[PDB]
Enzyme design. Structure first.
Site, mmCIF file in Angstrom:
data_model
loop_
_atom_site.group_PDB
_atom_site.id
_atom_site.type_symbol
_atom_site.label_atom_id
_atom_site.label_comp_id
_atom_site.label_asym_id
_atom_site.label_seq_id
_atom_site.Cartn_x
_atom_site.Cartn_y
_atom_site.Cartn_z
ATOM 1 N N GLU A 1 5.030 5.109 11.458
ATOM 2 C CA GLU A 1 3.603 4.831 11.658
ATOM 3 C C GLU A 1 3.326 3.926 12.835
ATOM 4 O O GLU A 1 2.401 4.171 13.625
ATOM 5 C CB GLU A 1 2.953 4.298 10.381
ATOM 6 C CG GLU A 1 2.584 5.430 9.437
ATOM 7 C CD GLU A 1 2.325 4.976 8.026
ATOM 8 O OE1 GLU A 1 2.417 5.827 7.111
ATOM 9 O OE2 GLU A 1 2.020 3.781 7.825
ATOM 10 N N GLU B 1 0.838 -1.201 0.000
ATOM 11 C CA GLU B 1 0.000 0.000 0.000
ATOM 12 C C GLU B 1 0.874 1.252 0.000
ATOM 13 O O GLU B 1 0.604 2.211 -0.723
ATOM 14 C CB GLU B 1 -0.909 0.047 1.212
ATOM 15 C CG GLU B 1 -1.789 1.274 1.206
ATOM 16 C CD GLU B 1 -2.581 1.461 2.481
ATOM 17 O OE1 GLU B 1 -3.189 0.482 2.965
ATOM 18 O OE2 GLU B 1 -2.617 2.610 2.975
ATOM 19 N N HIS B 2 1.958 1.221 0.760
ATOM 20 C CA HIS B 2 2.824 2.378 0.829
ATOM 21 C C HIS B 2 3.542 2.677 -0.467
ATOM 22 O O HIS B 2 4.011 3.797 -0.682
ATOM 23 C CB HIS B 2 3.841 2.201 1.917
ATOM 24 C CG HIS B 2 3.329 2.559 3.262
ATOM 25 N ND1 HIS B 2 3.738 3.694 3.925
ATOM 26 C CD2 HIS B 2 2.410 1.960 4.057
ATOM 27 C CE1 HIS B 2 3.107 3.771 5.079
ATOM 28 N NE2 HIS B 2 2.292 2.736 5.182
#
Lengths: 54, 446, 51, 54, 49, 105, 423, 57, 146
Positions: free
Chosen positions: B137, B60-61
């Site tokens: 994160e 996703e990143h």
């Protein structure tokens, strides 16, 4: 601070017959509770001595 | 005027189609000038092994950071320039990438989504830049008690299964994951029959289909065959994980029993009982007069700052319970009341309250399916989990069928005398002992 | 003034606890019977005829 | 005070043989004791409320 | 980073009906409860006697 | 209206004087037995009434202590007897019964 | 193949009230009553009154007790919410369409027959403190509240939240007065989603004919300027720099709205470089590490604030602010493209369309329009309106911000945060 | 394009009966949880985000 | 702090100074609330080490003798390793601060930059102060000379 207030035993006594908030109001008809208490120990006390012989 | 019932029949039927591929292209046309299009993939973290773990989250990143035809930064420039919104998410079983866009932009919107979905240019410089980001994160995620408690809850409820794992992965995997590791995950997973192209708004299903064939043509065609596993069921354990930390000022607690999972019709009734218990937050207007006894007692005696019931569905299993936030001296009381309500519902749900719960659900469902995004997400998820798209008219029918007997029957099956999975974080000195939490899962009068 | 407890819900509540209250009476019956070795009742029970 | 007096009657009766006047008056004081508590005092209460507009 | 927290392996202590991660604990919950409750049922019966 | 109303009214004024709380400077609502509905209504009284009510009761308890009574002049005349608490209590009862009706459905 | 849509129906009753309804054949209904009763209507003797009011939407009314309002609404799974801005209060109610009558009744009661009982109001005061604490935990809120208190000397300077010294002091009589002089026909609009025009209009003519308040949407916001600073230690310094811009609905307002998108507002891509954001690129160049920047644009009935908002490390505040300002300066000096104003345009237009995609947003746009313009402007003409913004208008907007008296609010460790004086 | 609030920027508070209270106008934070190190509480003397009355089947 | 701030003047003069200067003199005599509970022992050590030094100190004696003072000074007050001047340098700024209250009485102070203490202009201000008027000289007076 004050021992009467915080000692695990006295607390009881104190909050039962020393600092207990009571009506300024209660009259003679309110004495019977303590007299019943006195009647109780009296029956227990004399009653015991009677049993040391009966 | 048009009745509620009638209004449900008015909702246009979700249109389904399949590419000679396995790609299901589904849509729901409306008259809006705006739409949401996207790809819902059957990729999660429940699909990963202990060392791949964090793979999807890593992808996703990288997803929007460059494709082969759209390098480094151009994809953004295109989305931004047309005023569109590009987003993405990953849970333990699902992954999505969707774009909010002007209806006319549907072509490019799709062309872009495809590019991201197949030609992900996982350039080393970036795969490397992302690792310091994802690590960051994790550091912030650590400050969200709530996120930590549900991770904990999963960790213990699903001890030893893949569902025990978190989405983002452990730090060691974040720093060691190779490009090979990612490449493999995509190939193993991002393949046609496991992904749905969805859309909702001002578009015609024909258009959608034209596009699906146009830019998604050529995935599982010369593919299928060997190396495609199914998911193994996950053992629910029923245990406790208490992370004691008196430095935090409010305790988080999350208790749950094992839920049936996505497909089970039993979910509707479960959802109605939950609705009866409901939620609470200290900013709710109306405290003492709230219907839910939990909420009302909670509000009156200030037994918490918030609580919420939930029903997290996974294939064949799930978490069914409640989460709450409270002062260190209220954990016990809160636990007692919550359990009291489950028991009560198990043994004595009255008829009146079940209609409230039902009404709450009809209002939640219909209120939730409002705007293209939520609908597109419902199309995409539904196809991945029901294989169909369940028309409101049917959910109503299902809700309608629930009455008190059903509630106390269905609640008993999952709650009555069952072992909870308990997760505690914060100043939890007064979190009741498990034995006692377990004893509160049945009662001696019944 | 027991009218406060008279309505539909209360009626549903009573039905819900009926099997339980019935079973709790079954427990008390057998319970007394067995504990006093109820001559009258026990004679009917097969295998508990210790006479 | 009727209740008190009625108990005083009951005391008196109980100390007397179960004959002549005593039987029926003893049976009257009995019904009375119960009427005074089970019905007369509760009713007097409702009336005294009514008299106060309560 | 709280994500590095995995629950320690309990296989060493689990009942045999609950050794497999592959399979539901639902199937044996009854039997497992059955077993432990029978233990207390019998006890009460004993104490009763 | 006529002889009839006056008779009931005078029967009431008679009991009032016989009840005799007015001799202690009290008011009908001061003698009300405190229960849940009553506690709430006492709670809802505005500052002034609540203050007056406490002083009245204090004056009385104080008298009932030394078993004296107020001079005749200062007894509380029927008529002049304010049912200050009534409206509050009625509303508190009226509120509860609503919950109670709601609880039946 | 959906049915063809309805058209919104709009009506201005001669007493000032506005009614607007749309029959989306939705399974749910949304009814909202919008009132020009926002915080700008409080004065120095009654601050926070409209907050306490905002929080009392379920105290007892005539014809509906608190308990009934709560139980009644939850029985049908309905919602009652009140939302405020410095100009409006907006009581919205939602439920399935078979239940609008019971929810409509409740709404009417909360807005037209509130009793504000001493003891219920007293019980509610502590909620101001809880409510304020929860909002103020986002640094932005203190900032924007200081921004406004610094920018105006009047009305718009009031905050959405009760001053601390007023918590516990607002009186039921003040609540009565606030409603009586602000909740009147001429300051009200009744928006309906999923209901029918005749029902709305019937309701309006029966229950919303109330007049005896004040008149205009103004005490009149005097713009002032100056700045406010709150030392904190939050690691991140939060700051906003603004100037008087344009009143909402005026054509200059759309120039500012477009300028906002040239400079850059929110992100369009999950974790992006923010390539099309003039500000974010301009700060990037001179600043290497944690920070956010955004153009800020608030527009009111008789004024407006435009500028930017920065979040940066305590030591980078100066640099982030300075660079951000310089970048606006650049557009003011004429260095603005054409495909830029175009992209901005497309971001604005699309954003608007998306903003009224759901009911919650459609009803709020309709409600606020009714209140600010006394009309309903369709999407096509709003798009036409944005489309008429010319490059020079955007440049002029930029020019106005640069040369106008400023307003700054900032919180954090301010040791390196410039003063205005020094910008 | 009125609706000062959703014209993104100034503040709008929302009180509710069933749902949770909100504060939600426009300024950064968004392109900030990305250039990370943005903590936030985990329910410190607090409420709850995303809020409720959004379910499914 | 609570005890001091109960006189309206104190908040006022603290705001006065925070508004007038951008620097040094803007600091208050009282701890900011966010700092209460946060000042560290190391910060106390540092404050003393860099400010309590010989060059920033004076030892005044009443009722003692010079040789004793000087003896004490030379024995115990020979400490140097702080900073130097009586300044970071107060930058004057201007601007104002407002605190809504409800106190019935409004408290307000209006000021401009004047003169540094000891300079001759300072005595002009000091005299101006008495022309305009400072405290009262007579118990409950009309304040005729003010």
């Amino acid at each position: 601070t004050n021992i009467r207030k915080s000692h695990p035993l006295m607390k009881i006594v104190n909050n039962a017959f020393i600092d207990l908030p009571a009506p300024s109001n209660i009259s003679s008809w309110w004495n019977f509770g303590s007299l019943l208490g006195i009647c109780l120990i009296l029956q227990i006390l004399t009653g015991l001595f009677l049993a040391m012989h009966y | 005027t048009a009745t509620y019932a009638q209004a449900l029949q008015s909702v246009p039927e979700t249109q389904v189609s399949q590419l000679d591929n396995g790609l299901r292209v589904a849509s729901e046309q409306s008259s809006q000038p705006t739409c949401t299009v996207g790809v819902w993939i059957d990729a999660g973290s429940r699909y990963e092994s202990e060392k791949n773990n964090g793979a999807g989250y890593f992808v996703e990143h990288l997803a929007f950071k460059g494709t082969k035809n759209r390098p480094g930064n151009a994809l953004e420039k295109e989305v931004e320039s047309m005023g569109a919104h590009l987003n993405a998410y990953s849970t333990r079983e699902h992954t999505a990438y969707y774009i909010k866009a002007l209806s006319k932009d549907l072509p490019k919107a799709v062309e872009l989504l495809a590019d991201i979905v197949q030609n992900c240019s996982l350039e080393d410089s970036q795969i490397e830049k992302e690792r310091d980001v994802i690590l960051q994160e994790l550091q912030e995620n650590d400050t969200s008690m709530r996120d930590v408690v549900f991770n904990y809850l999963h960790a213990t409820a699903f001890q030893g299964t893949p569902l025990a794992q978190s989405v983002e992965g452990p730090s060691e995997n974040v720093r060691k994951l190779s490009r090979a590791d990612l490449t493999e995950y995509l190939s193993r997973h991002y393949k046609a029959p496991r992904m749905v192209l969805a859309a909702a708004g001002g578009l015609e299903h024909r258009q959608l289909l034209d596009l699906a064939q146009k830019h998604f043509s050529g995935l599982s065609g010369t593919y299928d065959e060997d190396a495609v596993p199914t998911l193994s069921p996950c053992r629910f354990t029923g245990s406790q994980i208490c992370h004691r930390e008196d430095g935090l000022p409010l305790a988080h607690v999350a208790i749950a029993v094992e839920g049936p999972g996505w497909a089970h019709p039993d979910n509707v009734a479960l959802q109605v009982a939950n609705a009866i218990i409901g939620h609470y937050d200290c900013t709710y207007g109306g405290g003492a007069h709230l219907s839910s006894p939990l909420a009302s007692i909670a509000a009156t005696n200030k037994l918490c700052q918030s609580f919420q019931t939930f029903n997290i569905c996974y294939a064949d299993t799930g978490l069914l319970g409640a989460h709450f936030v409270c002062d260190h001296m209220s954990i016990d009381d809160m636990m007692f009341v919550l359990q009291g309500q489950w028991m009560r519902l198990c043994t004595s749900a009255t008829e009146s309250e079940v209609l409230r719960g039902k009404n709450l659900l009809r209002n939640a469902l219909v209120s939730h399916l409002d705007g293209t995004t939520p609908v597109c997400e419902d199309i995409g998820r539904s196809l991945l989990t029901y294989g169909r798209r369940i028309p409101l008219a049917e959910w109503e029918s299902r809700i309608a069928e629930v009455d008190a007997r059903v509630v106390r029957e269905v609640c008993s099956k999952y709650f009555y005398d069952q072992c909870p999975a308990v997760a505690g974080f914060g100043p939890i000195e007064q979190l009741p002992d498990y034995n006692r939490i377990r004893s509160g899962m049945f009662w001696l009068r019944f | 003034m027991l009218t406060r407890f008279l309505g539909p819900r209360y009626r549903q509540l009573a039905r819900n606890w009926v099997p339980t209250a019935q079973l709790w009476g079954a427990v008390g019956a057998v319970g007394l019977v067995w504990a006093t070795d109820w001559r009258l009742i026990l004679d009917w029970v097969p295998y508990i005829n210790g006479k | 005070w009727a209740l008190v007096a009625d108990l005083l009657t009951l005391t008196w009766i109980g100390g007397q043989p179960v004959e002549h006047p005593y039987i029926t008056i003893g049976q009257l004081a009995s019904v009375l004791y119960f009427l005074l508590i089970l019905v007369l005092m509760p009713t007097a209460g409702t009336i005294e409320n009514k008299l106060l507009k309560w | 980073s709280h994500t590095d927290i995995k629950v320690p392996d309990f296989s060493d202590y689990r009942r045999p009906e609950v050794l497999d991660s592959t399979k539901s604990s639902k199937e044996s919950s009854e039997a497992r409860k059955g077993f432990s409750y029978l233990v207390t049922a019998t006890t009460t019966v004993g104490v009763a006697y | 209206v006529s002889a009839s109303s006056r008779w009931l009214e005078g029967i009431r004024k008679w009991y009032y004087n016989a009840a005799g709380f007015n001799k202690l400077g009290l008011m009908r609502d001061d003698t009300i037995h405190e229960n849940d509905d009553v506690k709430e209504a006492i709670r809802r009284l505005p500052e002034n009434l609540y203050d007056d009510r406490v002083f009245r009761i204090k004056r009385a308890l104080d008298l009932s202590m030394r078993q004296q009574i107020l001079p005749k002049e200062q007894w509380t005349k029927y008529e002049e007897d304010k049912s200050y608490l009534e409206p509050y209590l009625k509303e508190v009862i009226r509120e509860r019964k609503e919950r109670e009706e709601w609880a039946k459905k | 193949v959906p049915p063809h849509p309805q058209d919104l129906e709009f009506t201005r009753l001669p007493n000032g009230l506005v009614i607007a309804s749309l029959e989306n054949y939705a399974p749910a209904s949304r009814i909202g009553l919008f009132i020009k009763a926002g915080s700008r209507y409080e004065n120095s003797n009654n601050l926070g009154t409209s907050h306490l009011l905002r929080l009392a939407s379920s105290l007892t009314t005539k014809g509906a007790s608190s308990f009934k309002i709560t139980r009644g609404i939850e029985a049908v799974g309905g919602k009652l919410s009140v939302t405020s801005t410095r100009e409006n209060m907006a009581y919205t109610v939602e439920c399935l369409r078979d239940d609008v009558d019971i929810l409509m009744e409740f709404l009417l009661n909360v807005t037209t027959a509130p009793e504000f009982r001493r003891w219920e109001v007293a019980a509610l005061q502590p909620q101001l403190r809880i409510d304020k604490a929860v909002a103020l935990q986002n640094p932005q809120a203190h900032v924007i509240e200081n921004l406004h208190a610094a920018a105006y000397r009047n009305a718009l300077a009031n905050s959405l939240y009760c001053p601390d010294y007023r918590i516990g002091k607002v009186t039921p009589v003040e609540l009565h007065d606030y409603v009586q002089n602000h909740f009147t026909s001429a300051r009200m609009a009744l928006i309906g989603l999923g209901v029918s025009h005749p029902v709305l209009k019937q309701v309006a003519e029966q229950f919303l004919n109330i007049r005896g308040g004040l008149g205009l949407s103004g005490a009149k916001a005097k713009y002032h300027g100056g700045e406010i600073r709150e030392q904190n230690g939050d690691s991140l310094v939060h700051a906003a720099l603004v100037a008087e811009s344009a009143a909402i609905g005026s054509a200059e307002a759309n120039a500012f709205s477009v300028l906002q998108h040239v400079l850059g507002a929110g992100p369009h891509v999950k974790r992006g470089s923010n390539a099309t954001s003039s500000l974010y690129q301009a700060v990037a160049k001179g600043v290497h590490q944690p920070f956010d920047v955004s153009a800020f644009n608030a527009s009111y009935s008789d004024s407006g604030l435009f500028g930017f908002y920065t979040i940066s490390q305590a030591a980078s505040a100066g640099d982030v602010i300075k660079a951000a300002y310089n970048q606006v300066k650049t557009i003011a000096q004429g260095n603005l493209s054409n495909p830029d104003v175009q992209a901005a345009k497309n971001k604005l237009k699309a954003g608007y369309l998306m903003s009224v995609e759901s009911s919650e947003g459609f009803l709020d746009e309709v409600g606020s329009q009714a209140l600010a313009a006394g009309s309903y402007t369709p999407p096509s003409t709003v798009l036409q309106q944005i489309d008429a913004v010319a490059d020079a208008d955007v440049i002029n907007a930029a020019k106005k911000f640069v040369s106008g008296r400023k307003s700054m609010a900032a919180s954090g460790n301010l040791g390196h945060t410039p003063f205005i004086d020094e910008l | 394009m009125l609706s000062v609030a959703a014209r993104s920027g100034p503040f709008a508070p929302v009180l509710s009966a069933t749902s949770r209270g909100v504060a939600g106008a426009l300024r950064p934070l968004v392109q900030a949880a990305v250039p990370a190190t943005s903590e936030s509480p985990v329910l410190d003397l607090k409420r709850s985000v995303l809020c409720r009355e959004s379910l499914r089947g």
